[PDB]
Amino acid sequence: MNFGSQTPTIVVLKEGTDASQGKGQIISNINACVAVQEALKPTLGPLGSD
Amino acid sequence: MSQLFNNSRSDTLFLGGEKISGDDIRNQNVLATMAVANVVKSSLGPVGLDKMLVDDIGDFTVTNDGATILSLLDVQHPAGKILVELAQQQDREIGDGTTSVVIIASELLKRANELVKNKIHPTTIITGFRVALREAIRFINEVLSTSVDTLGKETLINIA
Amino acid sequence: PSNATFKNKEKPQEVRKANIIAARSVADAIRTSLGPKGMDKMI
Amino acid sequence: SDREQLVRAASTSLSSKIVSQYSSFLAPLAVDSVLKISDENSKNVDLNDIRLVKKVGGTIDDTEMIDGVVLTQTAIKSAGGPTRKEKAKIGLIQFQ
Amino acid sequence: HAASQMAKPEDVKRRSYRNYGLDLIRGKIVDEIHAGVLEPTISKVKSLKSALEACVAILRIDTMITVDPE
Numbered sequence: 377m378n379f380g381s382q383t384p385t386i387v388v389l390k391e392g393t394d395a396s397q398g399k400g401q402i403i404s405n406i407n408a409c410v411a412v413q414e415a416l417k418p419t420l421g422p423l424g425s426d
Numbered sequence: 427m428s429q430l431f432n433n434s435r436s437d438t439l440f441l442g443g444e445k446i447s448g449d450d451i452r453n454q455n456v457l458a459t460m461a462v463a464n465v466v467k468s469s470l471g472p473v474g475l476d477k478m479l480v481d482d483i484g485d486f487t488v489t490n491d492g493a494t495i496l497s498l499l500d501v502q503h504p505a506g507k508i509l510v511e512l513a514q515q516q517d518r519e520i521g522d523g524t525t526s527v528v529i530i531a532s533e534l535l536k537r538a539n540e541l542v543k544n545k546i547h548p549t550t551i552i553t554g555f556r557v558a559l560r561e562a563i564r565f566i567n568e569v570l571s572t573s574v575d576t577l578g579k580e581t582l583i584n585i586a
Numbered sequence: 587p588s589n590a591t592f593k594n595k596e597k598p599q600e601v602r603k604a605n606i607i608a609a610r611s612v613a614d615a616i617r618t619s620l621g622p623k624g625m626d627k628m629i
Numbered sequence: 630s631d632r633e634q635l636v637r638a639a640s641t642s643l644s645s646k647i648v649s650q651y652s653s654f655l656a657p658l659a660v661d662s663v664l665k666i667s668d669e670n671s672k673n674v675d676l677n678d679i680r681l682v683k684k685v686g687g688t689i690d691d692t693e694m695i696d697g698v699v700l701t702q703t704a705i706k707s708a709g710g711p712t713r714k715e716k717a718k719i720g721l722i723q724f725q
Numbered sequence: 726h727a728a729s730q731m732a733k734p735e736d737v738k739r740r741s742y743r744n745y746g747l748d749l750i751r752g753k754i755v756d757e758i759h760a761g762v763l764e765p766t767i768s769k770v771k772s773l774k775s776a777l778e779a780c781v782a783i784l785r786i787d788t789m790i791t792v793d794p795e
């Protein structure tokens with residue numbers, strides 16, 4: 377009845393598509409913005425650096 | 427949180443790995459602490475739930491204790507090894523609060539790093555914790571309760 | 587003047603400059619470890 | 630033999646590092662451990678006569694003074710031997 | 726807890742609060758004596774001290790130096 381020896385299961389998303397649940401991703405997104413924020417932290421002020 | 431790795435410096439030539447300084451170290455040390463603190467954060471208390479760790483030979487270990495879960499997690503980072511050996515020191519001495527002492531240390535390094543960014547020295551921060559802890563142990567002595575008017579072994583049962 | 591001694595050698599002063607910057611590089615690594623406000627160094 | 634200048638002079642060096650809040654009772658511990666034990670006057674004052682035993686576990690406050698010598702080694706207990714003995718004379722066996 | 730610490734020494738009910746708190750099963754405030762939640766005093770003693778020394782060891786670090794293996 378079957379076409380061959382075995383039949384591997386289908387991944388729902390495409391192979392290599394990154395996905396994650398829970399509170400870890402939104403913390404990573406916030407930490408990503410804070411990482412960009414730290415570059416512009418000492419630039420603020422009339423006594424900042426280029 | 428750290429990005430854009432430090433440049434190899436030609437004026438300071440040391441054998442082995444490159445030197446790195448600034449606030450990135452305390453950011454990396456806290457980031458290394460969150461790598462282990464988030465592991466033990468979920469398995470705290472009755473409602474807490476634990477995880478599994480395979481031994482790469484089919485065997486695994488479902489562990490609730492903080493000393494056991496950190497013993498199998500061989501942390502290559504230097505700052506994480508302090509908390510790994512602390513739990514091995516905690517469970518041998520007292521055998522209780524192994525998860526809380528790591529969670530307390532992680533929250534301290536979080537807010538301590540925030541205070542260093544607020545431009546107060548760590549020596550003043552450490553002096554603030556020691557005078558606070560000396561009053562805390564004095565307050566722990568105030569809230570003690572001696573077992574009295576208890577029927578049989580009930581105080582040993584409910585505390586277990 | 588023209589009769590002054592040129593000394594024919596600029597390599598010695600350049601090597602001394604390379605040593606001073608190399609010596610000041612590691613000296614400035616441990617500058618923040620001095621006094622009560624010093625910081626520890628884990629190697 | 631002055632416990633005023635020698636104690637506070639040792640705490641100045643301990644304050645530039647770790648372990649300094651507990652230096653109030655480790656500073657005078659350093660004074661008597663050298664002047665009253667190692668050598669009294671000059672020319673000879675030795676640090677190899679001082680012993681520091683490294684041990685994992687415990688807290689920083691647990692460090693205290695011991696009037697006598699402490700052995701880093703432990704008993705065999707293999708045979709059922711005593712591990713404490715009041716009023717015991719200690720003999721050094723240098724053979725097998 | 727605050728309403729208990731601030732209170733007069735002479736106030737039974739408020740003082741009692743100093744004794745109770747969070748419950749994880751039913752989700753309400755109940756007495757620990759009747760519930761049976763209790764710990765030793767030694768468990769908290771020398772736990773914050775170990776966490777204190779753990780914080781001191783990392784907090785005092787400024788720079789990190791790594792030597793590659795031979």
Ligand SMILES: Nc1ncnc2c1ncn2[C@@H]1O[C@H](COP(=O)(O)OP(=O)(O)O)[C@@H](O)[C@H]1O
Nearest residue numbers: 470471472491492522523524525526748749762
């Ligand atoms: N039945 C309970 N009701 C309320 N709190 C509890 C109960 N059981 C445990 N806890 C709390 O959970 C914390 C951690 O407990 P436990 O996981 O047994 O210790 P460890 O942190 O060493 O793993 C304790 O500080 C305790 O106050």
Ligand SMILES: [Mg+2]
Nearest residue numbers: 521522523524
């Ligand atoms: Mg427990």
Ligand SMILES: [Mg+2]
Nearest residue numbers: 641642643645
């Ligand atoms: Mg000194």
